[PDB]
Design a binder for this molecule. Structure first.
Ligand code: GDV
Length: 572
């Protein structure tokens, strides 16, 4: 593939296996990438629109911010951005074209449909590690995400109680390194502050917030945000919030030479928690300076963005909303991994959105499946392909065991019932066999074979993933769920042996094995990931676990009828 898919692509059926024109005037971040690809004469022209190197191609460069033209043929290679970030993006597409020292002959004109695209590290729970964030930034660069908003709810220097204090030295030098890596990867590091729970609407707190921003600025930070989500009391006043942000804008963002994004998260950040008899959102829309972004999570705390939904907000805030999409964040279903495809967001509303960022799981590597897909969606939503992008994400993250990770992820998709009413499809490949088998049973051999095949594949996938060393941090994240997933598949297998139950003693051996396996699952659920909120480890919960639990109860019923016995048919 190419990921995100370019706006315009023309491929000829020739392949190609140098002089460098523009290396001293082009984006050094792009030139570095080219040289890193070029350990190894025909022209390579690199530059931004305006540079001498690419004058001949200025009609070909899209007149869009972050746009670029890329051309490969026998004679020469052109890598020409509308601006510095666009040249870097040309190189990111170039890097994907180059397979085994060879290139296809291609012409591409590309640019993003959504202006700001990325990740908000904005969840409750253990914030990502420094090394996880370093890896994230590089991944964002490769996938043309230009935005990283730093706002972990549990960072005491971001929120309660120490938002007024500078970071200690160790954390500051870490943030400084994050900013430098972000810069090198063309990502805006957006430092967010979350003051609303205890802010006073006086000059002293106003001044402390600006002094904090100044210290962040000294660490290299050039984009800023103020979050007013999940607070009560005086900090919720929209007139004062807008005055404060307008003051930050006028006294700081319009005084520095180089500040990029200024963003706020509103107290009412979704439709369903908006007071319909209040004027909160219209006050912000009317009073907030027009260059300041306003975030929005959709119709509900957790939701996908619809045309009607984006219309409702935009009418009120008098600008296109900056989407905070609450997926794959799992901080309210901490016992689940959410590794499914990214879907449900309207692909025709790019013009109606200023930005689109994903709030991910506290599991940084595992979040890359969704992050890669959100990158692809936000760059070219018109051509967003849910399932193919999901597969592409997985192959990128774990090429040495991609089919095994697809298997594990297909069955670790749903959230289970939760206080936000948000669910995802899961296990749809086997859901037909599951329902056709179980209805008959309470059956087509092809359906029994599908179930059998599925359990066998789950075990192969679990054992290969456990021992994979290509992405150790990913495996460390998911290991407890992989163990539980393997136990699930073993239990399925033993239940299907009970169905095929040949004699009474064999059936009783299977029955005792199933009970032992239930106990081990309970053990894992009681000893791994024992967080205060949703402790434990749940996996394959939507389709698979219920099919096994129900089939077990059904076969046992059937056994007790047959032998006038009283075996326990419970499943919990
Ligand atoms: C803008 C936003 O979603 N803010 C926070 C947030 N807040 C909530 C709430 O559910 N907040 C809430 C809802 C109703 C009543 C009080 C607080 C969910 N989330 C996200 C998902 O858990 C959480 O990660 C995030 O930091």
């Amino acid at each position: 593939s190419l990921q995100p898919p370019p706006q315009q692509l023309i491929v000829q059926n020739k392949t190609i296996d140098y002089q460098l024109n523009g290396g001293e005037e082009a984006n050094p971040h792009a030139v570095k990438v080219l040289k890193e690809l070029l350990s190894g004469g025909m022209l390579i022209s690199i530059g931004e629109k305006g540079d001498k190197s690419v004058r001949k191609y200025s009609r070909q460069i899209p007149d869009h911010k972050e746009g670029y033209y890329l051309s490969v043929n026998e004679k020469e290679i052109v890598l020409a951005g509308n601006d510095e970030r666009g040249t870097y993006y040309a190189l990111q597409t170039f890097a994907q074209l180059l397979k085994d020292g060879k290139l296809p002959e291609v012409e591409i004109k590309d640019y993003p449909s959504v202006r700001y695209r990325g990740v908000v590290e904005g969840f409750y729970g253990t914030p990502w590690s420094h090394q996880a964030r370093l890896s994230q930034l590089k991944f964002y660069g490769k996938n043309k995400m230009n935005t990283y908003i730093y706002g972990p709810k549990d960072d005491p220097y971001h929120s309660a109680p120490n938002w007024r204090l500078p970071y200690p030295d160790k954390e500051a030098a870490q943030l400084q390194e994050l900013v430098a890596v972000a810069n090198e990867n063309e990502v805006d590091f957006v430092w967010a502050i979350h003051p609303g729970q205890d802010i006073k609407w006086n000059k002293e707190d106003r001044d402390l917030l600006l002094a904090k921003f100044e210290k962040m600025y000294q660490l290299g930070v050039r984009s800023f945000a103020v979050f007013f989500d999940d607070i009560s009391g005086e900090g919720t006043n929209p007139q004062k919030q807008a005055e404060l942000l307008n003051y930050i804008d006028e006294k700081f963002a319009q005084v520095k030479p180089d500040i990029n994004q200024l963003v706020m998260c509103p107290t009412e950040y979704n439709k369903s928690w908006s007071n319909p008899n209040g004027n909160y959102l219209t006050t912000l829309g009317d009073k907030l300076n027009p260059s300041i972004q306003i975030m929005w999570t959709g119709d509900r705390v957790i939701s996908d963005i619809t045309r009607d939904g984006i219309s409702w907000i935009n009418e009120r805030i008098k600008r296109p909303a900056y989407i905070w999409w609450n997926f794959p964040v799992s901080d309210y279903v901490r016992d689940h991994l959410l590794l499914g495809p990214v879907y449900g967001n309207d692909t025709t509303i790019a013009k109606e959105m200023s930005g689109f960022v994903t709030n991910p799981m506290e599991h940084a590597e595992s979040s890359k499946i969704a992050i890669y897909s959100v990158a692809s969606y936000a760059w070219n939503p018109a051509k967003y392909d849910t399932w193919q992008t999901w597969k592409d994400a997985i192959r990128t993250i774990l090429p040495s065991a991609a089919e095994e990770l697809e298997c594990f992820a297909m069955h670790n998709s749903d959230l289970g019932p939760n206080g936000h009413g948000y669910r995802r499809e899961e296990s749809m490949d086997i859901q037909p066999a599951a329902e056709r088998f179980l209805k008959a049973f309470k059956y087509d051999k092809a359906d029994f074979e599908t179930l059998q095949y599925t359990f066998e594949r789950m075990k192969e996938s679990a054992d290969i993933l456990l021992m994979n060393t290509e992405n150790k941090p990913l495996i460390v994240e998911i290991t407890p769920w992989v163990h539980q997933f393997k136990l699930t598949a073993e239990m399925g297998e033993e239940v299907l042996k009970m169905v095929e139950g040949r004699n009474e003693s064999y059936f009783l051996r299977k029955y005792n094995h199933v009970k032992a396996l239930q106990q081990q699952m309970f053990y894992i659920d009681q000893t791994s990931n024992q967080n205060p909120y949703q402790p434990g480890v749940k996996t394959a919960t939507r389709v698979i676990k219920p099919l096994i639990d129900r089939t077990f109860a059904t076969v046992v019923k059937f056994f007790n009828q047959k032998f006038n016995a009283h075996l326990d048919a419970t499943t919990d």
